[PDB]
Design an enzyme around this catalytic site. Sequence first.
Site, PDB file in Angstrom:
ATOM      1  N   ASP A   1      -6.344  -3.970   9.617  1.00 42.87           N
ATOM      2  CA  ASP A   1      -6.979  -2.975  10.473  1.00 42.87           C
ATOM      3  C   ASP A   1      -7.660  -1.927   9.594  1.00 42.87           C
ATOM      4  O   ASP A   1      -7.781  -2.092   8.378  1.00 42.87           O
ATOM      5  CB  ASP A   1      -5.972  -2.388  11.469  1.00 42.87           C
ATOM      6  CG  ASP A   1      -4.909  -1.474  10.838  1.00 42.87           C
ATOM      7  OD1 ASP A   1      -4.963  -1.134   9.640  1.00 42.87           O
ATOM      8  OD2 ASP A   1      -3.995  -1.063  11.589  1.00 42.87           O
TER       9      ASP A   1
ATOM     10  N   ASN B   1     -11.485  20.551  19.426  1.00 41.12           N
ATOM     11  CA  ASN B   1     -10.197  20.581  18.735  1.00 41.12           C
ATOM     12  C   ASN B   1      -9.739  19.181  18.332  1.00 41.12           C
ATOM     13  O   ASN B   1      -9.144  18.999  17.260  1.00 41.12           O
ATOM     14  CB  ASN B   1      -9.152  21.251  19.633  1.00 41.12           C
ATOM     15  CG  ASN B   1      -7.833  21.468  18.925  1.00 41.12           C
ATOM     16  OD1 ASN B   1      -6.903  20.670  19.057  1.00 41.12           O
ATOM     17  ND2 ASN B   1      -7.751  22.543  18.146  1.00 41.12           N
TER      18      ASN B   1
ATOM     19  N   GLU C   1     -11.175  -2.275  19.971  1.00 37.13           N
ATOM     20  CA  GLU C   1     -10.324  -3.014  19.038  1.00 37.13           C
ATOM     21  C   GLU C   1     -10.872  -4.365  18.611  1.00 37.13           C
ATOM     22  O   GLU C   1     -10.443  -4.881  17.565  1.00 37.13           O
ATOM     23  CB  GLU C   1      -8.932  -3.253  19.640  1.00 37.13           C
ATOM     24  CG  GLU C   1      -8.166  -1.979  19.942  1.00 37.13           C
ATOM     25  CD  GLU C   1      -7.719  -1.253  18.696  1.00 37.13           C
ATOM     26  OE1 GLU C   1      -7.829  -1.820  17.584  1.00 37.13           O
ATOM     27  OE2 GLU C   1      -7.257  -0.100  18.832  1.00 37.13           O
TER      28      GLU C   1
HETATM   29 NA    NA Z   1      -8.826  -3.663  15.508  1.00 36.90          NA
END
Ligand code: NA
Length: 164
Positions: A20, A132, A11
């Site tokens: 984001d 998957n 992040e």
């Molecule tokens: Na981020």
Amino acid sequence: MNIFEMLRIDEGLRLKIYKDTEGYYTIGIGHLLTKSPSLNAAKSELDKAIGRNTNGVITKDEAEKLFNQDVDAAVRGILRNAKLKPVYDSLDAVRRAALINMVFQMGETGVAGFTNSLRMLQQKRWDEAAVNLAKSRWYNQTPNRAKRVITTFRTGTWDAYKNL
Ligand code: NA
Ligand SMILES: [Cl-]
Ligand SMILES: [Cl-]
């Protein structure tokens, strides 16, 4: 390596409101503020989350406090969800972190929707689950991060997060 270090890699850390990967206002270590296009609405969410009138900027300590709350909230969301809890309980500690990572990024409801992937994970069919999991909007929109998380599910190791 652990879930905090893992998510900090995935992040980043930014102390000013930013958008984001989906274009949504965010701050800190991936703390989503709102899906609204209004920066004013995002700033209001930030002030409410921190408990003071910000200038759209927080401290590192404040960013780490939201992060602690958000990791806690991801685990809480897994444990109260009837689809996610049995998968989480069935996993080892490294793969548990991979599931927390997904819930942090997409939310409890989003991950609970991965019905067939979750079954393969509970069956411990790791290569099949990995194939998957990549057949998803998630993988297509954030492929390098999804590749790291999927490698963690496939191998049960932190190999995707070492020496980056
Ligand atoms: Na981020
Ligand atoms: Cl919050
Ligand atoms: Cl990515």
